[PDB]
């Protein structure tokens, strides 16, 4: 029921991937990369935190109809790394993550949570690197952590 009850200064972003393979690689090696604008957005959030709070990432594969897990950003963005490590060469850079939950949670469990910073659109209709208001993110994080088959 009650996970994440102690996250006073957290910042939470949506990750939308076109590649489940990339997600599987992210889970295996605890690393991720985003778009150029996505990297810079996540980089600013992580570094402006200065270890004072967690940066959580809510992962969902595009078109899957569910979210697939939760990870915490554990590193700043390194923009000069080996290329071609992901599904496409389009992804440049790298940062560490620590996956906390790896589980499929249907969008029905989350669609009624709406983001006041995204024209009050449901959280399940967000784009890649959309930031979630912390009070709405606590709801999503709790539902994911406590969802069971």
Nearer to ligand M1A, 97 or 141 (CB): 97
33-62 residues in contact with ligand M1A (CB under 6 A) are 33-34
Contact assessment for residue 67 and residue 144, using Cβ atoms and an 8 Å cutoff: yes
The CA distance from 26 to 24, in Å, is 5
Place of tokens 């669609």: 111
Nearer to ligand M1A, 78 or 139 (CB): 78
Among residues 11, 17, 97, 137, which is the contact residue for ligand M1A, using CB under 6 A?
Answer: 17
The two tokens of residue 107 are: 């969008």
The CA distance from 136 to 13, in Å, is 11
Q: From residue 73 to residue 112, what is the string marking binding to ligand M1A with x (rule CB under 6 A)?
A: -------------xx---x---------------------
The CA distance from 37 to 74, in Å, is 19
Angle made by CA atoms 126, 90, 78, in degrees to the nearest 5: 85
1 is in an annotated binding site: no
Nearer to ligand M1A, 31 or 110 (CB): 31
Shortest distance, position 37 Cβ to ligand M1A, whole Å:
11
33 is in an annotated binding site: yes
Which stretch of DSSP H or E encloses residue 100? strand 95-106
| Binding-site residue set | 16-18, 22, 32-33, 62, 86, 91
Contacting positions for ligand M1A (CB under 6 A): 16-19, 22, 33-34, 86-87, 91, 128
């Amino acid at each position: 029921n009650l996970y994440f009850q102690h996250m006073k200064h957290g910042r939470v972003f949506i990750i939308k991937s076109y590649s489940e393979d990339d997600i599987h690689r992210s889970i295996k090696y605890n690393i991720w990369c985003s778009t150029e604008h996505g990297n810079k957005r996540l980089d600013a959030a992580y570094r402006s935190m200065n270890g004072k709070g967690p940066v959580y990432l809510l992962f969902s594969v595009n078109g899957s109809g569910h979210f697939c897990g939760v990870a915490e950003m554990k590193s700043a963005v390194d923009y000069n790394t080996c290329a071609g490590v992901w599904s496409q060469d389009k992804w440049k850079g790298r940062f560490d993550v620590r996956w906390i939950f790896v589980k499929d949670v249907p969008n029905s469990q989350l669609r009624h949570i709406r983001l006041e910073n995204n024209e009050n659109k449901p959280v399940t209709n967000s784009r890649d690197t959309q930031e979630v208001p912390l009070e709405k993110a606590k709801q999503v994080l709790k539902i994911i952590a406590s969802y069971k088959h």
